[PDB]
Design an enzyme around this catalytic site. Structure first.
Site, mmCIF file in Angstrom:
data_model
loop_
_atom_site.group_PDB
_atom_site.id
_atom_site.type_symbol
_atom_site.label_atom_id
_atom_site.label_comp_id
_atom_site.label_asym_id
_atom_site.label_seq_id
_atom_site.Cartn_x
_atom_site.Cartn_y
_atom_site.Cartn_z
ATOM 1 N N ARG A 97 -31.063 -23.060 76.178
ATOM 2 C CA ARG A 97 -30.538 -23.901 75.076
ATOM 3 C C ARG A 97 -31.667 -24.189 74.097
ATOM 4 O O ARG A 97 -32.773 -24.542 74.528
ATOM 5 C CB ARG A 97 -29.881 -25.228 75.564
ATOM 6 C CG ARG A 97 -28.743 -24.974 76.576
ATOM 7 C CD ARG A 97 -28.186 -26.295 77.040
ATOM 8 N NE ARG A 97 -29.175 -27.055 77.846
ATOM 9 C CZ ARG A 97 -28.946 -28.244 78.391
ATOM 10 N NH1 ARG A 97 -27.727 -28.764 78.389
ATOM 11 N NH2 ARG A 97 -29.952 -28.955 78.858
ATOM 12 N N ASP B 272 -29.470 -38.614 75.864
ATOM 13 C CA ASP B 272 -28.541 -38.249 76.932
ATOM 14 C C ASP B 272 -27.224 -38.933 76.677
ATOM 15 O O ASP B 272 -27.107 -40.162 76.804
ATOM 16 C CB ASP B 272 -29.162 -38.593 78.290
ATOM 17 C CG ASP B 272 -28.388 -37.980 79.473
ATOM 18 O OD1 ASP B 272 -27.827 -36.922 79.285
ATOM 19 O OD2 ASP B 272 -28.417 -38.570 80.576
ATOM 20 N N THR B 273 -26.204 -38.122 76.447
ATOM 21 C CA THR B 273 -24.850 -38.657 76.374
ATOM 22 C C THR B 273 -24.217 -38.565 77.758
ATOM 23 O O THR B 273 -24.575 -37.678 78.522
ATOM 24 C CB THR B 273 -23.996 -37.872 75.329
ATOM 25 O OG1 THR B 273 -24.043 -36.442 75.567
ATOM 26 C CG2 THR B 273 -24.447 -38.150 73.849
ATOM 27 N N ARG C 168 -29.272 -28.164 72.613
ATOM 28 C CA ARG C 168 -29.237 -29.458 73.297
ATOM 29 C C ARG C 168 -30.086 -30.405 72.465
ATOM 30 O O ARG C 168 -31.219 -30.070 72.057
ATOM 31 C CB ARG C 168 -29.878 -29.228 74.691
ATOM 32 C CG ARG C 168 -30.084 -30.487 75.483
ATOM 33 C CD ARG C 168 -28.796 -31.219 75.790
ATOM 34 N NE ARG C 168 -28.931 -32.241 76.855
ATOM 35 C CZ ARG C 168 -29.429 -33.460 76.639
ATOM 36 N NH1 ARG C 168 -29.762 -33.814 75.388
ATOM 37 N NH2 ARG C 168 -29.476 -34.393 77.614
ATOM 38 N N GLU D 47 -21.586 -37.324 80.504
ATOM 39 C CA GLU D 47 -20.809 -36.087 80.604
ATOM 40 C C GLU D 47 -19.360 -36.441 80.244
ATOM 41 O O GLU D 47 -18.990 -37.617 80.316
ATOM 42 C CB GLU D 47 -20.953 -35.471 82.016
ATOM 43 C CG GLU D 47 -22.386 -35.088 82.412
ATOM 44 C CD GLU D 47 -22.981 -33.985 81.522
ATOM 45 O OE1 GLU D 47 -22.223 -33.063 81.140
ATOM 46 O OE2 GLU D 47 -24.211 -34.016 81.220
ATOM 47 N N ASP E 142 -23.954 -34.108 73.434
ATOM 48 C CA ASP E 142 -25.329 -33.795 73.085
ATOM 49 C C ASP E 142 -25.581 -32.284 73.098
ATOM 50 O O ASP E 142 -26.734 -31.896 73.101
ATOM 51 C CB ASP E 142 -26.344 -34.545 73.987
ATOM 52 C CG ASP E 142 -26.113 -34.273 75.495
ATOM 53 O OD1 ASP E 142 -25.460 -33.235 75.824
ATOM 54 O OD2 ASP E 142 -26.685 -35.013 76.312
HETATM 55 C C1 THP Z 1 -33.067 -32.754 76.620
HETATM 56 C C2 THP Z 1 -33.784 -31.782 77.566
HETATM 57 C C3 THP Z 1 -33.152 -31.348 78.739
HETATM 58 N N1 THP Z 1 -33.818 -30.504 79.572
HETATM 59 C C4 THP Z 1 -33.261 -30.119 80.896
HETATM 60 C C5 THP Z 1 -33.639 -31.182 81.934
HETATM 61 C C6 THP Z 1 -32.466 -31.298 82.870
HETATM 62 O O1 THP Z 1 -32.640 -30.344 83.964
HETATM 63 P P1 THP Z 1 -31.606 -30.424 85.181
HETATM 64 O O2 THP Z 1 -30.363 -29.717 84.652
HETATM 65 O O3 THP Z 1 -32.320 -29.658 86.283
HETATM 66 O O4 THP Z 1 -31.284 -31.841 85.505
HETATM 67 C C7 THP Z 1 -31.295 -30.852 81.970
HETATM 68 C C8 THP Z 1 -30.600 -32.074 81.392
HETATM 69 O O5 THP Z 1 -29.630 -31.637 80.425
HETATM 70 P P2 THP Z 1 -28.167 -32.173 80.372
HETATM 71 O O6 THP Z 1 -28.212 -33.673 80.135
HETATM 72 O O7 THP Z 1 -27.496 -31.438 79.239
HETATM 73 O O8 THP Z 1 -27.561 -31.890 81.749
HETATM 74 O O9 THP Z 1 -31.868 -30.136 80.884
HETATM 75 C C9 THP Z 1 -35.104 -30.040 79.214
HETATM 76 O O10 THP Z 1 -35.729 -29.254 79.990
HETATM 77 N N2 THP Z 1 -35.739 -30.421 78.094
HETATM 78 C C10 THP Z 1 -35.128 -31.288 77.244
HETATM 79 O O11 THP Z 1 -35.758 -31.608 76.215
HETATM 80 CA CA CA Z 2 -25.756 -35.113 79.001
#
Ligand code: THP
Ligand code: CA
Length: 129
Positions: A75, A34-35, A29, A37, A15
């Site tokens: 991102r 959510d994919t 992103r 890891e 993702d």
């Molecule tokens: C998809 C997305 C992720 N995020 C943030 C939330 C999560 O914070 P935390 O890292 O504190 O958990 C993290 C999840 O992304 P990943 O799934 O790539 O890890 O990215 C956003 O803020 N907005 C979004 O739209």
């Molecule tokens: Ca992910």
């Protein structure tokens, strides 16, 4: 919402992808999904699926939603299209991502993607098997 040009710099995982957008490299992103890891179950399959989709595309576009365009990691947050097909939806329809991270104001394609997740679950695909 509007589609804007980008070019692939490199696949990262299911993702996230690095694209060149308005001439600058940035990691994107994918919104609303959510994919797993890479180290988790279906993680490798999700990364492979997105990689193929973005590397095979002749035209890549990004579409921002109405709300925040960057996350706290810097991102880009977007829907991504590969030759006109949305990667976000394609990962969900294939049971390689869950609908997730639905935040008020960046959720234009929420119901499209939920619809895709329902069909993937119906079919017991991948994560839903
Ligand atoms: C998809 C997305 C992720 N995020 C943030 C939330 C999560 O914070 P935390 O890292 O504190 O958990 C993290 C999840 O992304 P990943 O799934 O790539 O890890 O990215 C956003 O803020 N907005 C979004 O739209
Ligand atoms: Ca992910």
């Amino acid at each position: 919402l509007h589609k804007e040009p980008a070019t692939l710099i490199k696949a990262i995982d299911g993702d996230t992808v690095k694209l060149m957008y308005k001439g600058q490299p940035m990691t994107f992103r994918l919104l609303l999904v959510d994919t797993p890891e890479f180290n988790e179950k279906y993680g490798p399959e999700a990364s492979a699926f997105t990689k193929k989709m973005v590397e095979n595309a002749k035209k890549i576009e990004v579409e921002f939603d109405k709300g925040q365009r960057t996350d706290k990691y810097g991102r880009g947050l977007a829907y991504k299209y590969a030759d006109g097909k949305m990667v976000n939806e394609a990962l969900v329809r294939q049971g390689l991502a869950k609908v997730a991270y639905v935040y008020k104001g960046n959720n234009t394609h929420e119901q499209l993607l939920r619809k895709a997740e329902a069909q993937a679950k119906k079919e017991k695909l991948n994560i839903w098997s």
